[PDB]
């Protein structure tokens, strides 16, 4: 058709007319790498193509499956003018940088041929498998070799041979050294728990990438694949191209993976995120004003508001001398409430921080949240399935009611608060991963309330090896005075009578999430006047631990 | 007694009687006579078969694709005499279903799926 | 002060809102269904409570680029997607300079 | 279906005499197989779009459409602006215009509905011929005047418009159905649209310019597909018979109708009851003797509200309605007094701006006594009257089987979820007995259903968090089914402290040994034992008013707290804390404070008043005061 040919001649001039930063084109440096036959990078920016033409780029994303062979012959002709290339290796369009994102639940029947982008995250990982693209068959009737055999989505066989007398209406023969294959991966994606406000219908979608899109594809990648949905009996498969592991949903573009200077980050961030974190960081009550502005329904108890804010940040995963990362995250848990008022502490964090889960005691068995293993039904092979602790990486997992549970589940999670890693080798299948997820436990008393007659170790079910690996341990303060119920009752009246009017925060929730990425930028150091202050405070808690003679209650 | 169901609700009915005795004091004479006396009364005892085949027998019918639940002594003895010996020997699950089929005589079946009420 | 950050997104949302109405293939739409359709399409990490604010402080300044009205259910939003961005950017830049010059 | 038209004239003869005038030789053309002619049905529908005036149309619902002017004449400028070319036409408007056209649409909607799609296009081109959309304007008739069931499906209603309302349990995935075929030649470039109507597969062997057999390969990546969503639906619980399980009919949805009806709602399904022979082998054309019954989905009065408002001003409505739930027991009115306020609950409020979105205002009543003495009528009477009631067994059902569990399913190749009983009765009332001897594993899963209102089940690699909430009642029983004065009420109840604290009120069936107690109880059941039905409908109101009294205040009157009536909740909370004597210094949790607010919202809802005064606040603490003296 003449419509597809018009979209290729004008696209060839885009790589020479539209400049980049200076008077050079970003595709000029990419042409020097394509000469070496092991790397085929063809990144095309969509936000820059609309500046030169808009009506031309409309038919590209609307009908992409038909212009698929036209993009391979146009880019190969343009690079031929730069430098002569051999005629024995093809390429692949790597169209990325799409500002428009589509939801998995937003799909109909005409989604094929649309060059869009799908979000989500991948859980299951499959090995590479080749694919017959450019092959060569041989007729077993007249002994003639037929070259240039392209396989689309079915078994494309030559119905008419070279001899116009008879043909082979059965099978052929796969060539050996005259057949080019392209390997791919048949990964299994999964809907993210931070984008499902209503309805709980989990499903997946077939995603197939290209040859150079391997390596960076392991169990625990929250990337968003980009490509075009292809329809197969009759199934669905999303043909991807490149990957880009970023933050869940939207968010920033830098956390604990890429490090740069301070002059290159200012050119990418907005101007509204500069003076907001500049004049407010010089105050003296910055650590206290962020406690009331986030929990307006909680009156009093300043010991639980200053620990939840530090839970998101905390320590950093350092590296020892031999190259082994130890700890680097704070853990806390409360006890002294029969699930009557501590439930709101886990709900405010689940809605705020998207990297958080929520489960009860009986809802989590032995595995499920760590790493589940089960033989596949359509492959018959022992695979490894990620849990809830692997999806909430660099975050915090919530868990309530620590009583209605057995003992086999606590043993399988002992390597989470001390090593922050998962090492499960079951059935000769190695699956050693890592996750920096803090455990936000919530212990519950035996008889519901704290008994004053019994000891402090007889009201809880936690033993010594469990509390030794755990970090901070708080207990809810219980006061039986006439002023406690008189002050908490006034906050309940103002909340149920004045709907959406009792909140009097000084900083909205839009700026709280912005200050989460600035903490992971400039890593603080240790002053030379603090080594003498830490060695003199540990000896105080050493004598505070041994109240009797040697041991007592909490071991420090 | 009276079986009219007035004021929306349903009053009680059907005479009830219990008897304690060692199975061997000519109890078969008091059971075989009443079995042939009533027109709708089958000879069912506490033993001789399994306890899940006389009050809760499930039949997996794969020819139609349904799930039914029958008994053997309280599903076919409508307006008759229910003959059963050794009232205190079965499990607790067999004695729980008697709480509703004895007062107002309404069979209540609710095992996640089967939602019906048999009249017997 | 609640719309200062919204004025900074005017040169940014001009390119995002232009592509989300072309890839969807649907010509006209409404704002009631927009609370669950384009709420996750536009790259905005801000809370959805202020999503219905940029649809009023932008169309009233340029009635020709976007014309719509209000009713009660399924509105009639018609966006002129057949215009080149070489001249649309110059139209929205007239009111932008007036905000920073107060 | 594309059927041809056969003329009904004398075969072999052109015209037997009859000059000039047309006698018995007019427009006798009609479709072979249907008494509906395209040349006659189109003319009868064009006047329906121009000469139809509905003065009884409202203004709050038909905004933008004039009432005095024809309604369909103003809809010409509405289809080209909404985007989708689908006009919504109600079947009730057709009967009020022409009675002949109304009977032909329901009797055979296979050729009358496609006929209406061509009549609207002719009128639309005569008003706005420049405004174009995707394909063409289609008519989706809905809201019929028939209400039948799956058992009353007569054999004469085949291929007719049948509207049966029900409840959708769960839905299937997405099954693409290839409609028009698409092919591409291996030599030249030529497209061919092969209509695969009536489920037929055929491909042309002759190309455009090549003219070579076996040279046109098939490509199924550029054609138009359609999702086949298998939707199941059974008989509605409001009109289902008692004594048998309802029948489930399979529903189909294509085009834009896919993913429109969410599972778990009550939407009136308007479709065509068709029947297709089941194909056993897709290769050889085989016909099964048993067909598949499928239905292709297409899409209060003022004489009773005024009577409910007059009873709200009467100060005796709260006492008459409380005594209607006691058809046998004369006394013991305080036990069933709190059950009447359970159906109302209160208006649910939202506080997502402060980090606390979900919030339940339902009341959970706790009972205790002998299961059979006075609790035999309070467990089966709130099931037949209330349509939103689901009865289930405690020991007869499993712990995970009652809610939403995970079960294998090799048919869909996906671990799908299954429903239960309490997960379907949302915004209603659940029925469940045996709480004293229930399973140990069942008591643990109830710590977040009626407490957190979010069933979070993350096990076996299944991440699913259900948001089902329903007020659940319980009926406990002591260790000896009798109150023991030698021991306190704490030791009698075997439930832990964390379980009994989640309930609001608490009662206990007491049987005093007083001689004068039988003079007011035994003399009442005997008086109504010999009397038949000559006094039930004379001294007691009917049950038709109670069902209509709660279906009006749950979506019209939203009460809220004020500044004066809310100050009494603080003083009453401090007095009920330093109880002592029985247990000690307890009740220091926001549980009883939250349940006390729910009692005030339920009392003001029965009075039909959004403003809560200090009168209803004094009545909320009175019910809680009687619960303390009952268990002590």
Residue numbers in the entry:
A (entry chain 6): 20 to 251, 293 to 616
B (entry chain 7): 361 to 480
C (entry chain G): 445 to 546
D (entry chain 4): 122 to 420, 441 to 773
Publication text:
The final 3D reconstruction from 8730 particles resulted in a structure with an average overall resolution of 6.09 Å. In the hOCCM complex, hORC1-5-hCDC6 adopt a ring-shaped organisation with DNA located in the centre, the complex is organised by an upper C-terminal tier made up from the AAA+/AAA+-like domains and an N-terminal, lower tier made up of the WHDs (left). Consistently, we observe that 38 bp of dsDNA running through the core of the hOCCM has a length similar to the 39 bp observed in the yOCCM structure. Large sections of the structured N-terminal and C-terminal domains of hCDT1 (aa182-317 and aa413-546) can be seen in the structure, with the N-terminal section of hCDT1 binding to the hMCM2/hMCM6 interface and the C-terminal section to hMCM6/hMCM4, its position within the hOCCM seemingly similar to yCdt1. Interestingly, more substantial changes can be observed outside of the hORC1-hORC4-hORC5 motor module. Specifically, hORC2 and hORC3 are rotated by 12.8°, which generates a gap between hORC1 and hORC2, that accommodates hCDC6.Fig. 6 hORC-hCDC6 in the hOCCM structure. Inspection of the interface of hORC1 and hCDC6 revealed that a loop in hORC1, which has been unstructured in the context of the hORC1-5-DNA structure, became structured within the hOCCM and formed a short helix. This hORC1 helix contains the conserved arginine finger, which we observed to be proximal to the Walker B motif of hCDC6. Thus, the hOCCM structure suggests that hORC1 and hCDC6 form upon complex formation an active ATPase pair. Crucially, the AAA+ domain of hCDC6 stabilises the hORC2-WHD in the hOCCM, thus revealing its active conformation (left). Importantly, when comparing the hORC1-5-DNA structure with the hOCCM, it is clear that the hCDC6-induced 12.8° rotation of hORC3 enables the hORC3-hMCM2 contact, as this pushes hORC3 further out and generates proximity to the hMCM2-WHD.
